[PDB]
Symmetry: D2
Subunit: 476 residues, 4 copies
């Protein structure tokens, strides 16, 4: 149980550890270092040295080659990383393999982006030459959650490194073993010691210490709105900018002229993937009245066949990350049952699934009231809420009727309607007749309102990890 600081695995200052639990059987199988304020201090110091040293001395093209080599390392180590991630997060091996493949894709994409991050030359007064350069913030802080340790890591650190920053990472205490191994791969790729630091530990300890640290120049946060609020307010003490990738209540909007055959599998996977433990999960399906009942029936058909089991069983769902989250999903379903919200359909936990595991079957509820907590708050489970609308105006009103605004899905044949809704919908991403089929590495991702602010993924991410400097030359 050691942190990764200055290119070496180092013991926690206060020498305490945190258990690593396999959510498939709920049993500990490893430990991580319990990071504290002195651990963060050592990490920032190392990151500062690397940025002001070798890594910062590297050209963008040189940073790109390191990132490209790292991408190859991840690709060669897909099965190894997929095993670690699946055992640690609980997701089926098929999804953990996809996450590893996506991780290598992040590094590959940004590897080519490094030397193509351009500034500008601006028209100005006579005898003047104005140019702008996009420089790294310096030391970037990264808070990575448990639902996608590798994907969000490659998303955040991959862009920050490409921008020329040195990084300090505080991954989630419920899943972070994959991140540690990736750090080893980065060292093998030729990444200078200190350019990437990992401090494991609790959010209120290691995470809070990072957000309060004056040695950080920029913070990339992914997690709950409550914690995002705290991190922002903590970082404000040092006037440090924070990107917020928070939760969401993303709607699927289905009209009567939609191809329900091609829409059905996507609607299911959008809420079943990673057990619904995804910020951009399609947790709401809004159906035009004409096809409300027919689509619910198809959704009911699919959900009834879904099965939940151990990660290694590679079924539709694995277990949830822990008991606390399992109880949270239970509370949503229990409340809904009390309020007379009909459960249209639900999956099943396999009989041989470990009792000590935290398993929850996918659930499809219908006739959900728009104002009801189930349709307003993020469940972070495989629970889909279905309700009807009468026209485009109500579709828009319902879709934007929650405090969240992350992603939205539009399913209709009419092209004019497609682009028209996409403009009215409040979301960082709008998908038309799909829902993030590809990895979405190239697609800038982020929310509005209580889904946070800022954009990561895509080329756009590099702008958030750099700060513009304007140079004005008077030469006559």
């Amino acid at each position: 149980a050691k942190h990764f600081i200055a290119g070496e695995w180092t013991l926690p200052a206060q020498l305490e550890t945190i258990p690593v639990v396999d959510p498939s059987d709920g049993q500990p199988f490893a430990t991580i270092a319990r990071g504290t304020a002195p651990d963060i201090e050592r990490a920032v110091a190392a990151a500062r040295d690397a940025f002001a040293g070798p890594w910062g001395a590297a050209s963008a093209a040189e940073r790109g080659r390191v990132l490209m080599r790292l991408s190859a390392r991840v690709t060669d180590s897909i099965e190894e990383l997929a095993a670690i991630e699946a055992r640690d997060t609980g997701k089926p091996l098929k999804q953990a393999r996809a996450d590893a493949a996506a991780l290598a894709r992040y590094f590959e994409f940004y590897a080519g982006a490094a030397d193509k991050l351009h500034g500008e030359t601006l028209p100005y007064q006579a005898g003047y030459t104005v140019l702008t350069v996009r420089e790294p913030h310096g030391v970037t802080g990264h808070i990575v959650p448990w639902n996608y340790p590798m994907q969000i890591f490659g998303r955040s650190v991959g862009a920050a490194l490409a921008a020329g920053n040195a990084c300090v990472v505080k991954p989630a205490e419920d899943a972070c073993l994959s991140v540690l191994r990736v750090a080893e791969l980065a060292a093998e790729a030729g990444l200078p010691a200190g350019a990437l630091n990992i401090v494991t530990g609790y959010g209120h300890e290691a995470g809070a210490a990072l957000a309060r640290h004056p040695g950080i120049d920029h913070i990339s946060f992914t997690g709950s709105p409550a914690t995002g609020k705290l991190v922002t307010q903590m970082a404000a003490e040092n006037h440090v900018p924070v990107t917020l990738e928070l939760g969401g209540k993303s709607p699927q909007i289905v009209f009567a002229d939609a191809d329900l055959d091609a829409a059905l599998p996507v609607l299911v996977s959008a809420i079943v993937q990673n057990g619904g433990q995804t910020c951009s999960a399609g947790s709401r399906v809004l159906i035009e009245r004409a096809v409300y009942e027919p689509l619910v029936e198809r959704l009911a058909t699919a959900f009834n066949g879904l099965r939940v089991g151990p990660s290694r069983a590679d079924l539709d769902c694995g277990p949830l990350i822990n008991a606390k989250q399992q109880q949270r999903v239970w509370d949503f379903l229990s409340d809904a049952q009390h309020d007379g919200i009909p459960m249209a359909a639900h999956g099943q936990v396999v009989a041989d699934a470990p009792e000590s595991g935290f398993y929850q079957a996918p659930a499809l509820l219908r006739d959900v009231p728009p104002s009801h907590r189930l349709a307003q708050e993020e469940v972070f489970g495989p629970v889909l809420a279905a309700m009807r609308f009468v026209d485009e105006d109500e579709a828009v009103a319902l879709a934007n009727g929650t405090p969240y605004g992350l992603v939205a899905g539009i399913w209709t044949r009419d092209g004019a309607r497609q682009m028209r809704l996409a403009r009215r919908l409040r979301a960082g991403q709008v998908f038309i007749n799909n829902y993030g089929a590809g990895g979405g590495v190239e697609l800038p991702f982020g929310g509005v309102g209580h889904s946070g602010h800022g954009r990561e993924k895509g080329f756009e991410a590099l702008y958030g990890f750099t700060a513009l400097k304007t140079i004005a030359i008077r030469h006559g």
Copy 2:
């Protein structure tokens, strides 16, 4: 003494006023509405309706013409606005006129930028078309300080309007009469009611109510770091992004091979302008040892010739904004004198200048210790701190040695040295053989560290006043 809400002049909800004081004589000559939370509520309400209605229905090109007409109105009203601004802020008529001209330039520039704010189409999978659109936040909140009411209004509101946002403005209680008149010009120019809303009042009342309001989508702040911290933390409750344009300790770096004849007047005006009450004021001059004593003597002679009087007198410098700021400057100078920091030279207030006025002659101090409070903290007065350096390395160390990082000036003939230093210096702007060519409307402005974060002015500002939406179309 009224607010400007929904295109009409409205009495404050609680019917109380705040005295408007001419700092040239320290006497009240007008009153403003003491804005409170209900006033902010109505302002945001009006902005939201305007954004969802007429103003939001307007195309980019249509918004541009509105700003262009406003630009012409301001240009025609330069003398009128300059008289109001100078009387309220205390700055000389020459500077007050320049501010109004800059205000017109902001609106002129952004008028042409409105329909040229482009999104992107991104390479993606086969059968896919990916496009991005840069949409306004919606309702933008604007905190405007007293030192440059018109100029900062122009860069903030001008960019926000061009981006398609509806604006709620809380200008400074110490000076905001010019902004109120600008709002009328906007109405004349054809800006729909509600698109621009002005709520006067105290920062801890009206200003706080803005920062707390959940109906605002983005905040543009310009002021003290302490206040900027609070505003950020207040807005974090609603996950509202805040741009921070804070203070600075901007250095002038002079080498032995520099053109002292050309540098000398710029070194002076950079700290004399607006009585040194400027975020990016050149409050530090770093001189190479070889020319340290000669340049100090020339700076001393120049400072002795500076005259301070009433704003109508239109001299080198006017009074400070109030007694609280005057006392703050006194405390800096008294502490420096007690610690044995020699005052090389100072200007003199003219005899007939009102005793009740808040006059402070520009002061030149030498041999200032880098770690001393005079060289570390922002004075916001006409005080220049002078010290020497041996080489480029120490110049960089001294320049980046404060918590601030907003603007830096480089004076040297060596071309290689110019660019080499510009890369090393920590600042949003670096000026080579000049210092703010004026008005720097096209030049993106912003700080690092305790100088804040984010960028305003120039085309780049539009990216801060919009949010990227990605649309992924699966069409085959």
Copy 3:
């Protein structure tokens, strides 16, 4: 009867003028100077002095203000300019007014684009700073045709002026009076003498002398493919780049699910406007078999009700530009008739329309073979060729089955189909459920294949009128 050179109206070197004919009655009412090689020499030399002098010294922002003022003068002179254009070209007064308004819009758009034409800073080796500047070619040559003298002038020259070039224009001998007046307006607007030079005359004289002149740095050509070929080959002697805006055979693609009510008036206007004398005129309509006969019937009814008469009569259509072009249209129709191609319907020429005028009623032909001359060659008359297709594949095959690739229209409600075809169609512009909008000033316009190459209109045009200079600084 004089050229516009160096800010003054100067007599030609041959003094033998060219008649200006009103196509409404075929009678001359004015004269233009017959420019030859010596007239071109003085114009290029004048523009060279302007680019090296006052005009080249102006900032990008200063150039914008000139263009904005010119926009205002055109707007103030819409009636006068439209009167001239209508009398000279023959187009109905309503279309002449639109041309003038579009001219003012071009100047307005590029007035705001001037100081926003950014270059880049490129990531490079350590100790280096690489910046790119987009500098004007110098002296640009402009060949402007007779069908849209004002709009194409504003398109071509308005962009070249914003880019910072000085212009030498050779407008069409069949219609150029309006351009001469605009040149006066430009002078009144504050455009330096020599920045804009107009040399009237025959294409094989003044036009040929312009394309051959070594003093020109860039040629903007709009006209026939045969002449564009010759101009390119002539300019090849001086290695001068030429943008070729040539004709087309732009198809309108209508599917069975399209809105025929919304499509029908656009289908008609797209070929009737300016008497079909438009490069991007919708000269083909491709209809799905299911709605082939019903649409042709409605098109036939629409065409039978069309009225042609003198320009001042302001009917659906005016006369053609001259006898040669009238005969050209006659040849096409006569050729089609003899090949058994049916004429579904035709318009009406008013009985009191002057016999000496060049009138041609709009003609609708059906069942046109795809390989036939009528469906392959540009008519430049109000002639629409109708045919059917069975599926998207044939629709694409037919649409891309001519040497031309300029504009294409897609009429259908199927969203996926809209985007599918748009990517497959070989054209510079693809319109979905409209045709040409909407002015199209902001829309980059150009062709592929025999429709020419390069792009004008929109912001993109500035790249065609500038050349990239890369400055690589080694500073260590």
Copy 4:
């Protein structure tokens, strides 16, 4: 002796060949295929199939992976490629190796630019969404000369492939063996058959057939101005755009305050590299009068120390490409000597150098008249023309005084003068206190005047190998 068409090596149509000559000894050692029109026809048809099929179906990201793999293959085969290039061109093995590394760098650079070539979304009218897509031309033609077969193949084909085109290449009959080998490595890299086609042969046979072919959509030419003129006029028949990378007379401007110690080896290498057979070779040095004589003598010593021998000997310079070019350089030297132009110094050809080789010692001539042919015409040999200037004005006048305008070098310590001159110089690239740097892959390259037009290298090149399509959607 075969072409590379449709992924396999096929025999010539007429089965005739061309001798491959080693310029070191002027002896034949291999043969290339004598390509004619039918060979070109099969090459274009193959490229069309690849573009309409597999290669065109590849996503931008997929194209990049092939390019990166090819980049790795070139790096793996540097020694083999360097040996082939040196023996075929005559350049020293050291330079041929650098050419190989440059080739790998081109593929690496464009591999990452592939999925990052963005289009735009443009602000337009209400109810509209406008997007722009940058599409490949389709089939691109590439004329590659003999001086830098690998490097020019890299910048031209690498960009075209990254842009999504299929390529038909006609390399120089004097040196094209390395290009053939690279084609194999492309196939090994996974590049689909037909995506890259190589047709060897004489320019008046294979080259002319390529330039005239209507199946080509875009021509990338690098060679003599005379041939560049023909190609343009040949392709003008099909309205095919041609990028002209032609020769130059690039000056080095040295002032009295310049670092002569750092400048001296660069001044020499810039003209000595590849025996002066470089379009952007520094064939002129302009020296301020104060340091004219000291620098001439300085350059004289350096030139006198130069050694010329066989390529394998790996000295300062190899032989010229053939007898024709050798005679050309001899004619230049004869005229200069006959006109009394003094030769300050010259290199040394080893006395035992192969008599049947085409060797030429580098020559430094002084007091060269600006109007003399040696100072106006491109020699394409290791000849440097030295002259003096009084001030910056004369320096600019002399630098821009030739019909060429490709690259320019500025040597001075004064920063203002650096940027001031950089704006005044007519060139595609301006280097400050360096010249060409290293590789210059990221630096957009191109000329003005008789240096041609269009830009290649850098990210900018992608715009030259794509065409802009605009899609205007009316959706309400």
